[PDB]
């Protein structure tokens, strides 16, 4: 009854089906400037990872890199141009799964190492994000829907939120977790 062999209970299946339908608020979306001097919306990897963890549980989803391929490493002046693709397969405790390609780009740096590093890492993250979109709007599928983007723009400018470090983990030991783990062995 380990990962890949669970079957969702009607209650968890139903809760998730509904939750996945939600589109995400402005607090999730960020943007950058495309070469064409045009806005590009996207969700940052860390937000997607937390959405996934909260949607399926830290132990309810997984991902692996089926393959990563460096498309090219070009030196055209004193600078490097690098294109990398990754194929990421994400899976639920269910055994259900989705796979997609992510692409990573680095153009202009003078460091070969730094260029490769950027491109390889972004390809994986980009792939993880695209694979996860398959589960629904709440995991990013709304993101490329022009009507969603449009109605997002008609929303209030929004101030970045302050993070409250008051209750941040401040040491390794996890008392409650240790308690549970010791009772589990029984």
């Amino acid at each position: 009854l380990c990962f890949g062999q669970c079957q969702y209970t009607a209650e968890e299946y139903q809760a998730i089906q509904k939750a996945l339908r939600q589109r995400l608020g402005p607090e999730y979306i960020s943007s950058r400037m495309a070469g064409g001097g045009q806005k590009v919306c996207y969700i940052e990897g860390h937000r997607v990872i937390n959405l996934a963890n909260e949607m399926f549980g830290y132990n309810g989803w997984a991902h692996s890199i089926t393959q990563q391929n460096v498309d090219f490493v070009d030196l055209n002046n004193g600078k490097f141009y690098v294109g990398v693709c990754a194929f990421v397969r994400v899976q639920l405790k269910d055994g259900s799964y989705h796979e997609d390609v992510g692409y990573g780009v680095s153009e202009g740096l003078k460091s070969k190492a730094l260029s490769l590093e950027k491109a390889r890492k972004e390809a994986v993250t980009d792939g993880l994000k695209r694979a996860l979109r398959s589960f629904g709007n709440a995991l990013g599928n709304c993101i490329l829907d022009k009507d969603y983007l449009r109605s997002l723009n008609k929303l209030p400018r929004q101030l970045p939120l302050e993070v409250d470090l008051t209750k941040a983990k401040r040491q390794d030991l996890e008392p409650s977790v240790e308690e549970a783990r010791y009772n589990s062995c029984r």
Copy 2:
């Protein structure tokens, strides 16, 4: 009783068989201009993803990339011409499946990276969409039926639909979900 080993109950099977027969409304179909100065109808990936999730459940269908091949990367001026194909296999919790090819194209950009990226991604999405058509009209099989297209044109315009974020997910935490999941490990 995990993914790939379910067997549809008579009730779910019957409901789905019927639902799949439906053709989709104008709110799903979009179009672009082909090189021959001719309209081409298609369904955006995100719509197909949601159609699938609602038809089979977020844990009812899955897809993998059996293979992706870059056919060519030509530089014919200062611009790149790229053709990529992807073979996508989609499967139901049932074990039933359909596989098809998708193609991705990028012609005219000056960025090799941006060209490869566009082509690889679209090939995958295109392949996922074609594989899914095999299940029925509701998943896209009507889309290339000239009589369906014809009768779609005999409809009033279609204006951009408005998305309402009044109840957009703004926090990660899904209480209902956590409850259902908490009640499942016992």
Copy 3:
């Protein structure tokens, strides 16, 4: 008791054996002009897909591409000549199966990308259609029977039959399916 492991019940077996014998009416057959200035009859992919879904159930048949091979890509003027083959294996929930080759051709376009895309996609569809013919007339085995073709010509033409979009699907939500699904978790 998943896909590939079912055994047909005598009742379903018998109904299908019979239904498969039927030849198809004019409403399925379409035609194009061969190079030799000669009529060529065929069934469009989407019709075959629906025939299959109705004959076996959306979860009663499946298909995969065992292999797709690009035979050649020739540039003989400013135009491309492309030949592609696909091997498609279709299978029933039974485990029974048939495999065939399909071919895809593109001659004359100036776009390499567009040529490759056309040829790869048609090879697959063509192969799917040929593999499916093996199950019987109702799935297209009649199509190449000259006596059938002959007696088809001796029938009244058949103007494009309009499509009834009043009952079209316009939202992703499928309430009946959603209910039956909940009752299946049980």
Copy 4:
């Protein structure tokens, strides 16, 4: 108890052993002119497929292409000469099987694509037909028996038979089948 794991019941076994012994009437045999200006008898693929379906049931036999190899593609004027072989393995629900080679030829066309297409497709159908012969006369084993051919000639003009499409399938929906199917999940 799926395909490949059935065992024939004494009754079905016996009926088939007998039925397979029959030689086929003139209505099955067709002929063409060999290069040596000599008659060559053969059965059209579509007839063989129907013989097979009726003999074993749509779910009683299967076939796959173990391999297809293009022997050569020669351009000797402005025309193409192509030879292709296919190895086809046909199997019964029994697990019993037979495998043979089929060959496909195209000589004289100016289209490479059309030539490859013709040769690859015929190789498969030819292989399928030869593999099937192994089961008995009723599936084509008589066809190359000179004494059978001889006594076939000593018969009238097997004058073109008519194909009656009164009862031709005009829709996708199969009511008797749907009923049978929906009850199979009980």
Copy 5:
């Protein structure tokens, strides 16, 4: 209890052990002229196939091509010289088996295609026949026994029997089989 897993009952085993010992009559043997202007006796493939089907049942034996290799394709004038070998494995429902080589030859034709076609097909049939010999005289093992050949010559000639086509099959349907089948899904 499918193919490859049956065990012969004492009764069937014994009947077959005996039947296999028989040498075959003149009605099976045919001959051709070897290059050395010398008679060569052999059994035609179709006879061997029927011997096998009657000896073991249409579902009691099977064969596969473990491999086919084209040894050479020589053009020495305007004619082709082709040598092809095939390894054929035949098996009983028992699991018992025998494998042998078959060879195919085509010397003198001007068609490469026709030469390859002839050699490949004959290699397979030749291999199937040699493999089958291993089971006994009744399946051809006598054929190369000079004392058998000698005493065959000391026999009156025979007029190739006329095939009684009165009862020839002229229809696909086999109501006999179709019922034996129906009462097996039960």
Copy 6:
């Protein structure tokens, strides 16, 4: 309890152990002239096959070609010199087995095809014979024993026995077997 999984009963084991010890009479041995102008004794393949079938039952032994390799094809005048080896594995219903090499030679023919054919076939038969020798004298192990050969020579010649084609098979149909097989389905 299929081939490869039987265990010999004490009775059969004992009978065979004893029978295998027998040396074979003059009626089995034949000879040819070695290049050194010296007699070479050997058993003809068809005799060995029958010895095997009678010793173990048609379903009691089997053999496969683990590998066949063409050592060389030399043209040294207008003639061909060919050496071929085959590795043959023979097995009993027991699971017990023996494997050996067989060699095939063809020197002097002007036909490449005929040379290859001869060498390939003889390598296999030769290998099958050498493998079978391992089971005992009755299967050929005596054949290379100089003391056995010597005492074979000290015998009066013996005229070719005649093949009693009285009761030779003149039909396929074998009611005997067919009748038992019909009761071996219950």
Copy 7:
């Protein structure tokens, strides 16, 4: 019930889901100067290792290197420039898992060996750290969240921590451990 086959009890699952949400205090975060003269925050591998051990138990998580590839080793003066990537898969006792790429860089050393050593080691640790981030904020996912970084800066520098070696392990022997062990082979 070994590693990879456990299933989290509801109590441990819940405790860990909660614990993983925590962001980490200043005591975890360290920083270095990027080439762009800009601060880069990160967590040291040894802290991440302890975080993981305390969160899941020393036997609750694992990691393997699916692959490590040296991208390049360039000598551009008397100095080496090295880029290495590692794919690290971490897994819980659950069977759940996440995989990511890590990169290792060495620029400027004159020792090839020292350069390779630094890059291969950092690539692995970097990858382990990135893979672990997928489980939640508590394992590092907060680290790249600009709002978290921002609110981390609005805190007083912290003086260096003194470690207390008072109770440091001074012998290899672990008595309490040896007991427990010994009472388990029962």
Copy 8:
């Protein structure tokens, strides 16, 4: 309870353990002249085979050629020099086993084919003999023991025992074998 899965009964184990200890008499040993003009003793393959069959039963030992490699084929005048090695693995019904190398040599013949044939066959037989030696003196292990050879020489010359072909096999049939084996199906 087939080959490879038997376990020796205490009685058979004991009998064989003892029997294997015996050194073999002069009637087994033969010799030839080494190049160094020195005697070389050896046992002929056929004797070893019979020793094995009598020691373990025809179904008590087996052997296979794990690999055969032709080391070289040199033509140094008009003659051929060939060296071949074979790896032979022999096994008991027990599952126990021993494997060794055998070498085959042919120096001086003018026939390439005859040279290869001699070397390949001897390598196998030589290997089989060396592998069998591992079981004990009775199977050849004494053969290279100088003290055994020495005391063998101190024996009377010996006339090669006469081969009594009285009861020699003249029939394929084996009524007691066919008897037992007919009852084993019961």
Copy 9:
């Protein structure tokens, strides 16, 4: 219930979780001079090995070399420069595991053999040590923590303590062991 399939008992798990947290005393730490004229602390392999044996039991942990690769062997004067890496995977009886890279270096020796030997052996040990660190401070995870190193320096330099060889194993025989082992077969 062999290695890789145990499950820690709550008692052993708990003891180890705790023991692993300890940092190690000065008696474990040693140092060398880095090229930059800077101190480098490390733990000697043998200490690590004993820490592991005592922490998990001689039969509680294991390690294997997944791969070892020689990066380069350079001769730049009369001296050799060698870089080698090893990937070591350590596992607990649990099935839990951790893998890391180790590196081995040899710069300056004149012996190629001695250089390779040093580099290959250190790579393995280095890897084994790094993999083991993943389990906790007690196994080395503290070692690279600057605050730990710092507070280690503030200790009274430690005097290289003596080894008491009095009770040193002087023979191979192991009494209590041989007894305990003898009984385990009961």
Copy 10:
């Protein structure tokens, strides 16, 4: 309960443990002259084989050649220099095992074939001996112990013992053996 799956009984285990400790007497050790004009002690393969058979039973130990590699074949005058290595794995009925390398050398012969043959065969035997040494002194582990060699020299002349061929093997047949066998079939 076949080879590789037995478990030693306490009694057999204990007897063997003790027996293995014995060093072997002068009757086992032989010697040759090393190139350095120095004595080299060793045990002859046939003695080792018998030691093994008596220690574990003819069915208690096994060995296979995991690999044999020819290091070189040099011709430096008119003579050949050959080095060959073999990896031999020996196993007990237990499943326990040891593997080692053996080396084979042939320097000076003028025959390539004879050189290869000597080196290949010795490598195997040498490997078998080294592998077996791992089990204990009784199987050869003492042989390289200088203190054992030294105290062996202080023992008198080892006049070759006499092999009393009295009750040697004269026939193939083995009655007692054959009797247990007919009784083990029960």
Copy 11:
């Protein structure tokens, strides 16, 4: 319950854990002169083998060569320089295991064969010793501990004790071993 599947009983486990902690006396350690004119201590392979056999039982540990690679064979004068590495994996009846590299060196000999032989054999033994060290001091882990070495030197010489060959084995047969072996099959 064969090798690799035993579980140590608490009693054997405990005895071994304790025995493994012992450092070894002077009677185990030997030394040689390193090129740097410096003493190098080590244990001879045969001592290690016996230590192992006595610690775990002849059937309690095993080892295999996962791989052996020859790094180089250099000829720099008339002498050979050879470096060889071996990867040895040792395992307990437990399933627990440890793997390490061993290196073999040969510098200066004029015989290529003798050089390769020395390096390959030492690499294996060296690897076996290093692998074994992982189990504890008693198997060699102390050997490289400078404080142990130091306190070993502070001892008295020790005359290489005399080996007492009184009860040295002179026969093969082992009566008790053999008695137990006859009683086990029961």
